[PDB]
C-alpha cells in the first residue's frame, strides 16, 4: 500500500563528547577502612557539642567506598552548593505513593534504590550487572529462580532509624503488590518484576526474589531508579490504609511540602521550602558512602532546588546561577551555544549521541482502558486498524518536523522504535514511512473516511458515531516549548490530512495521572529508557504484563486485547529478559525492531541529541556523560562524588554549618 524503505541516515554528528569505558567494578565496593573523616565543623559544632553521634556509630560497618581510580578528577574536598532549576512543582515527599519533588534531580537525590544502573554509560559491556547501591550484594541459584539479595548492614536513615530489610519488605508489598498504590514513575506494577515474581524476608539485612523465569538477570535493572526506591517505614507504615483509618489518597498526602527532614537514603535532606521558589537540602549525617581515602559523602553541603521553568534552567546554567542543565530543547539550543561560545561563559556544554525522542502513541484499548465514551471508543477502534497508522505516519513530513524545532545537524528522521543512538539499534531493521500526504488520503478513503459535509474533515461512515466529522483527542505536556511545538505541528499535518485534532495541554502531575490512567486518544511523549537503552526497563518494549506498556493498557481487572504484532513482541522482549547469549539478543533486538516500525506500536516523531551543561568550577563530572542513557545525567554525574576546589568555591550556602533537624521540625540545625 506504502513504498517503505529505511531511515536516511542523519548528518554526522562530531563536537560531542567521548567516554572513557571501564570494568564494572571500577566505581565501588563495600569494606570497612580504617579510619573515616567528615567536614571539620560536623565534629567540632555538632559532635562536641554533643549533637550528633561521632561518625564510626553512624556509618554502615561496610560503606559503599568509591574507588579514585574512577574518579575523573580525584578525591575531593568539602564544601560549596549545587544549584539546580526545574520545572517541577514539589507534590509532597511520599515517592513510594507517587508522589513528585519537582523533578530535575530532587526525586532522584532523595530516592536511592537497591541498585544503580546511571553510570552504566561507562561501562564498556551492555550484558554488565547493575551497580550494587542499598542490596550490597546478591546470588542466583544452580536453577535461575532464586536470588538472594544482601544489603547494606548498619545504614541508617537521615534521622538516625536504621535501614534494614523491613523498608524493603514495606516498599514490596504495601507499594508494588498493593494495587491501590502506584509508585512514581508510572512502571511499578509487580509484572515488572516477571509475572509470578513473589519476594520475601530471610533476616534483616537479607531477602530472598523468586522468578517464574530461570536467570532473568534483566529485572536488576528494574530494582533501580525508579522502580524499586525504598521509603522509611518507621514514618510511611503508621500512616498506610493497611496498617491505619487512613485512605489511600490520605496516605499519599501524608508527607506535604511543608512537612521538613523527610528520612531519606539520599546524599541531602530537604531542610527549607518555599512555594513557587525553592527547595533547600543540607547533606545527610548518616550517610552510608566514603571515599578510597574515608572521608563520608557528599562532598557538597547543600543542594538548591528553584522553582521555574525547564527553559529557565538552560538560561541560568549559561548565566552561571545555576550549575546544571540538560539541554533537551531544540528551541533552546541556538541561544545556548551562542553563549557557550564565550571562553568567559560561567559553563561547558557537551553534546552526546541522539538518545532524545518523540513519539505519537496511539491508545489501543478497546476493553475499556480510561473508561471511554462512544466518541472515545470510536478513536481506539481506529488506532487498532493498521491502514489508519500507516495513513498517519505517511501524513507526517518529518523533515519539516525536525526543521521546526532546530535547523542543522541536530535532528533525525525519526520513524518509532529503539532510538538510533543506542548499540542495539539496526537501521536495515527500521521501517521508514516516507512523507506520502496522497497516498495518505486514500488509505483513509479505503477504511470508509470520506468528507461528507463538505467542510475539508473527513467524517466517519454514518454507521459509526451517526457518520459525524473525526474528532481525536491529543494529551500534551504543559511545562516544555518542544512537547507544545510538536502538538501544534501534529495538528496541522493532520488538518492537510482531513483529520480533526484538539490539543488536550496539562500539567505534568495531571499529564502523567491522565496517561496511566487511559483517559487519552493520542498522546505527545518523550521517550523513556527503554528506547535509549533497551536493557533499561526492558519491559516497557512490550505489553508483556497488563500495566507495563505505555499504550495499551487493561483496566482492573480485565485481560489484554492483544493485536497480534503486540504479541510478537511481547514474544520478542520475553526472550531477550531471559537471554544469556549476546549475539541471540542483538538479533532479537532487529526482530524486535522490526516489528515495531512495520506495524507502528508508536509513530515516531522526532530524534535528536540533548546536551550536559554543567558550571565549570565543579570537578569530578565524567567526560562524555549522555544527558539520558540509564538514566538522567542528574544520577549518571554521580553529585556526591562532585566537588569544587577550596579556591574556586562559590559562597551560595543558605545554611551554612547547619544540619538537618528531626523529621516534622521547623527546618534545620544549628548552633
Ligand atoms: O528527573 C530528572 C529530569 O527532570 C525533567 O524531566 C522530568 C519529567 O517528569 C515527568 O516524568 C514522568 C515520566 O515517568 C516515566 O518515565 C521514566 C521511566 O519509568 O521514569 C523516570 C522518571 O520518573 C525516568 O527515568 C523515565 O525513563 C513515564 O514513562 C513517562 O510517561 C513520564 O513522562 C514528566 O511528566 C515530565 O515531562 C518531565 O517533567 C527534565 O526535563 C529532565 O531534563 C531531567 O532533569
Ligand atoms: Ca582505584
Ligand atoms: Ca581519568
Ligand atoms: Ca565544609
Ligand atoms: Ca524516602
Ligand atoms: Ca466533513
Redesign the pocket.
Given at each position: 500500500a506504502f513504498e517503505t524503505t529505511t531511515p536516511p541516515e542523519p548528518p554526522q554528528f562530531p563536537a560531542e563528547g567521548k567516554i572513557?569505558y571501564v570494568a564494572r567494578d571500577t566505581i565501588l565496593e563495600f569494606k570497612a577502612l580504617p579510619s573515616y573523616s567528615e567536614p571539620d565543623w560536623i565534629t567540632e559544632k555538632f559532635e562536641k557539642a554533643g549533637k550528633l553521634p561521632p561518625l564510626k556509630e553512624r556509618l554502615p560497618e561496610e560503606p559503599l567506598v568509591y574507588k579514585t581510580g574512577n574518579?575523573?578528577?580525584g578525591v575531593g574536598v568539602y564544601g560549596d552548593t549545587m544549584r539546580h532549576v526545574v520545572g517541577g512543582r514539589p507534590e509532597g515527599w511520599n515517592y513510594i505513593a507517587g508522589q513528585s519533588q519537582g523533578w530535575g534531580g530532587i526525586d532522584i537525590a532523595l530516592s536511592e534504590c537497591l541498585t544503580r544502573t546511571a553510570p552504566l554509560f561507562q561501562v564498556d559491556a551492555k550484558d554488565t550487572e547493575p551497580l550494587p547501591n542499598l542490596a550490597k550484594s546478591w546470588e542466583w541459584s544452580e536453577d535461575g529462580h532464586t536470588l538472594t539479595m544482601h544489603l547494606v548492614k548498619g545504614a541508617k536513615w537521615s534521622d538516625g532509624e536504621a535501614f534494614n530489610a523491613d523498608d524493603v519488605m514495606f516498599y514490596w508489598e504495601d507499594a508494588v503488590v498493593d494495587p491501590n498504590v502506584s509508585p512514581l514513575g508510572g512502571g511499578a506494577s509487580p509484572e515488572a518484576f516477571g509475572e509470578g515474581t513473589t519476594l520475601k524476608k530471610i533476616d534483616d539485612y537479607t531477602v530472598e526474589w523468586t522468578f517464574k523465569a530461570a536467570f532473568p538477570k534483566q529485572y536488576l535493572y528494574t530494582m533501580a531508579y525508579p522502580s524499586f526506591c525504598p521509603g522509611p517505614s518507621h514514618i510511611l507504615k503508621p500512616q498506610h490504609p493497611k496498617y491505619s483509618k487512613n485512605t489511600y489518597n490520605q496516605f499519599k498526602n501524608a508527607f506535604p511540602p511543608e512537612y521538613m527532614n523527610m528520612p531519606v537514603m539520599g546524599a541531602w535532606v530537604p531542610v527549607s521550602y518555599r512555594p513557587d521558589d525553592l527547595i533547600v537540602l543540607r547533606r545527610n549525617p548518616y550517610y552510608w558512602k566514603v571515599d578510597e581515602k574515608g572521608q563520608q559523602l557528599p562532598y557538597l553541603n547543600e543542594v538548591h532546588y528553584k522553582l521555574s521553568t525547564w527553559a529557565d534552567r538552560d538560561v541560568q546554567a549559561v548565566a552561571g546561577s545555576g550549575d546544571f542543565s540538560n539541554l533537551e530543547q531544540p528551541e533552546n539550543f541556538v541561544a545556548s551555544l551562542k553563549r557557550a561560545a564565550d571562553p568567559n561563559a560561567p559553563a561547558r556544554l557537551a553534546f552526546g549521541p541522539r538518545l532524545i525522542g518523540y513519539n505519537l502513541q496511539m491508545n489501543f484499548s478497546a476493553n475499556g482502558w480510561g473508561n471511554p465514551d462512544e466518541r472515545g471508543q470510536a478513536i481506539r477502534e481506529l488506532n487498532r486498524n493498521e491502514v489508519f497508522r500507516q495513513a498517519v505516519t505517511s501524513a507526517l513530513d518529518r523533515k519539516a518536523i525536525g526543521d521546526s524545532l532546530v535547523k542543522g545537524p541536530f535532528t533525525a528522521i525519526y520513524p518509532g522504535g529503539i532510538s538510533s543512538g543506542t548499540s542495539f539499534y539496526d537501521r536495515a531493521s527500521t521501517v521508514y514511512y516516507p512523507f506520502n500526504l496522497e497516498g495518505a488520503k486514500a488509505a483513509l478513503a479505503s477504511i470508509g473516511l470520506k468528507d461528507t459535509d463538505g467542510d475539508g474533515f473527513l467524517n466517519f461512515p454514518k454507521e459509526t458515531l451517526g457518520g459525524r466529522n473525526v474528532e481525536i483527542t491529543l494529551l500534551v505536556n504543559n511545562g516544555y516549548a518542544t512537547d507544545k511545538s510538536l502538538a501544534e505541528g501534529l495538528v496541522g499535518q493532520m488538518a492537510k490530512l482531513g483529520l480533526r485534532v484538539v490539543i488536550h495541554s496539562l500539567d505534568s502531575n495531571q499529564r502523567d495521572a491522565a496517561h496511566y490512567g487511559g483517559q487519552f486518544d493520542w498522546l505527545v511523549r518523550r521517550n523513556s529508557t527503554e528506547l535509549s537503552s533497551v536493557v533499561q526497563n526492558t519491559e516497557q518494549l512490550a505489553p508483556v504484563g497488563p500495566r507495563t506498556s505505555w499504550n495499551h493498557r487493561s483496566p482492573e481487572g480485565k485481560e489484554l486485547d492483544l493485536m497480534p504484532f503486540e504479541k510478537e513482541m511481547a514474544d520478542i522482549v520475553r526472550k531477550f529478559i531471559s537471554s544469556q547469549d549476546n549475539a541471540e539478543r542483538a538479533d532479537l533486538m532487529k526482530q524486535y525492531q522490526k516489528v515495531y516500525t512495520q506495524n507502528l506500536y508508536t509513530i515516531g516523531l522526532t530524534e535528536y541529541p540533548g546536551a550536559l551543561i554543567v558550571n565549570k568550577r565543579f570537578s569530578n563530572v565524567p567526560?562524555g556523560t549522555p544527558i539520558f542513557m540509564f538514566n538522567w545525567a542528574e544520577d549518571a554525574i554521580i553529585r556526591e562524588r562532585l566537588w569544587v576546589a577550596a579556591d574556586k568555591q562559590g559562597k551560595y550556602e543558605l545554611f551554612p554549618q547547619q544540619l538537618p533537624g528531626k523529621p516534622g521540625e521547623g527546618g534545620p540545625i544549628n548552633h
Open positions: 572513557n574518579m575523573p578528577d567526560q
